[PDB]
């Protein structure tokens, strides 16, 4: 009964703290924003980082990111091989293409912000989250007797 | 002697005295009161309830939280020792906070 067309195991999403949206013949995985926070907001003017992996299965594709929270700047080759992938961000844990954001509008962890990823053949909106990686818990000041 | 009126106003809120069943630990006691979502971390003698941030819980997690005011805190003295016990023994106090995958 549990091994029919609808299965509880085959539809399970990976627990990765990121989105796995698709595009034109391109699959984007683990799309997240690095923005180490200190207060309720990350103020405009600060630069933040965009991280993901782009995969296709058979020979090249170009790409460009646009968004509404400031401007996105790319640095690198920014093309995909036949049976390979394009890694942009190096999330904490890995032992060169970089996506930087100027962030005209303030951001906060917990909400989703729309990003547009455009290729030479396909383009999608993603609505990415913010993820903190191997950063330890930040200290909270002690209370009093009350 | 063992007959009591259950719909008797005994609980002070931001709107006067109210019955027990209409209230819980999350009911504001005055207008604009800040109630924090706290978590149970340590020992009774080590500030059993502490504050929490949206960054602490990730996608596909769940945490149990309790209503904590700045007016309690630590539980070092005997005055805040009976105030941190009422929070943990409240019938309608605990809340589950979940984060949904984007």
């Amino acid at each position: 009964c549990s091994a029919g067309q609808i299965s509880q195991t085959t539809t399970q999403e990976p627990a990765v703290n990121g989105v796995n949206a698709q595009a034109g013949q391109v699959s984007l995985r683990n799309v997240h924003l690095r923005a180490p926070q200190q207060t309720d907001y990350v103020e405009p003017g600060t630069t933040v980082e965009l991280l993901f992996v782009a995969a296709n299965d058979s020979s090249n594709k170009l790409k460009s990111i646009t968004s509404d929270v400031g401007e996105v700047t790319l640095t690198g080759d920014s093309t995909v091989p036949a049976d390979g992938v394009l890694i942009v961000g190096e999330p904490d844990g890995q032992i060169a293409v970089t996506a930087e954001v100027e962030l005209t509008k303030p951001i906060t962890n917990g909400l989703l912000y729309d990003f547009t990823f455009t290729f030479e053949d396909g383009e999608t909106t993603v609505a990415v989250p913010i993820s903190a990686g191997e950063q330890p818990r930040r200290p909270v000041p002690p209370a009093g007797p009350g | 002697g063992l007959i009591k009126n259950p719909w008797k106003p005994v609980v002070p809120t931001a709107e006067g005295k109210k019955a027990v069943l209409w209230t819980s630990g999350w009911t504001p006691r005055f207008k604009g009161e800040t109630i924090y979502l706290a978590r149970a971390t340590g020992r009774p003698g080590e500030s059993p309830f502490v504050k929490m941030r949206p960054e602490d819980i990730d996608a596909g997690g769940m945490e149990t939280v309790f209503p904590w005011r700045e007016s309690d805190g630590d539980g070092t003295t005997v005055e805040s020792e009976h105030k941190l016990t009422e929070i943990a023994m409240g019938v309608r106090n605990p809340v589950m906070l979940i984060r949904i995958k984007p």
């Binding site: 309720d40 909400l111 | 006691r29 005055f30 207008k31 604009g32 009161e33 800040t34």
Partner: peptide, 26 residues
């Protein structure tokens, strides 16, 4: 019977505002 006051909606809904908090008991 179905419970009255338990209905689904199609309203978008806005992001909550930042909490300020009135200082002291009124």
């Amino acid at each position: 019977c179905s419970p009255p006051g338990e209905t689904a909606s199609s309203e978008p809904g806005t992001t909550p505002a930042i909490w300020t908090g009135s200082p002291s008991p009124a």
